[PDB]
Amino acid sequence: GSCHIRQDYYNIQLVVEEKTGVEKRSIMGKWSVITREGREPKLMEQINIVSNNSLSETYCYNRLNTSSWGRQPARQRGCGQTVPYWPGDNVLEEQYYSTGYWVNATGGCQLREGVWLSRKGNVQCQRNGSSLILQLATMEIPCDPVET
Numbered sequence: 054g055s056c057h058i059r060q061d062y063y064n065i066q067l068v069v070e071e072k073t074g075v076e077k078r079s080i081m082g083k084w085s086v087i088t089r090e091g092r093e094p095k096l097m098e099q100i101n102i103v104s105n106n107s108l109s110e111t112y113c114y115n116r117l118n119t120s121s122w123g124r125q126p127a128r129q130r131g132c133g134q135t136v137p138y139w140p141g142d143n144v145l146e147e148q149y150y151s152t153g154y155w156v157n158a159t160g161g162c163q164l165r166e167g168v169w170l171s172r173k174g175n176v177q178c179q180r181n182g183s184s185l186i187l188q189l190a191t192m193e194i195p196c197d198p199v200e201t
């Protein structure tokens with residue numbers, strides 16, 4: 054994905070084990086939470102590079118299969134919409150875990166069977182105050198009406 058060299062202002066404090074998803078306090082690891090200035094924190098993979106004619110490292114927002122972590126995210130996003138995670142949801146393009154980081158995930162934009170998170174969709178609803186629009190393929194609507 055998008056890659057960026059470590060800058061001296063980075064304060065890396067959280068590393069996540071790739072397969073187990075164990076979080077630990079550490080400044081250094083294969084997958085570390087990187088917070089670029091102003092940007093939202095992201096779990097990024099340390100990657101070996103050549104740069105200015107020398108061997109070096111960069112940090113890339115690469116895809117990671119979180120299935121083996123055995124723990125659910127707090128939010129997900131896909132196709133230009135960000136939504137609260139509700140149990141029963143499929144895996145979307147990215148997953149936000151509550152300690153505080155986005156993960157580039159292995160899913161798409163199908164939120165439930167036959168139900169896509171699509172900005173051009175035909176159903177408007179909300180989850181815990183957060184608005185979203187769905188495209189449907191009876192069909193259960195996995196969200197609440199906008200009327201209070």
Ligand SMILES: *[C@@H]1O[C@H](CO)[C@@H](O)[C@H](O)[C@H]1NC(C)=O
Nearest residue numbers: 054055114115116146147157
């Ligand atoms: C996720 O990572 C893959 C490479 O593993 C990259 O091609 C893709 O663009 C990334 N997705 C996002 C949303 O950054």
Ligand SMILES: *[C@@H]1O[C@H](CO)[C@@H](O)[C@H](O)[C@H]1NC(C)=O
Nearest residue numbers: 117118119120121144159160
């Ligand atoms: C992620 O790993 C799990 C097995 O633990 C399985 O769903 C599959 O191999 C992977 N999922 C995707 C979408 O690649």
Ligand SMILES: *[C@@H]1O[C@H](CO)[C@@H](O)[C@H](O)[C@H]1NC(C)=O
Nearest residue numbers: 137138139180181182196197
């Ligand atoms: C969001 O709303 C649903 C139903 O209205 C509720 O079951 C769920 O607990 C709410 N989520 C949070 C984080 O409050």
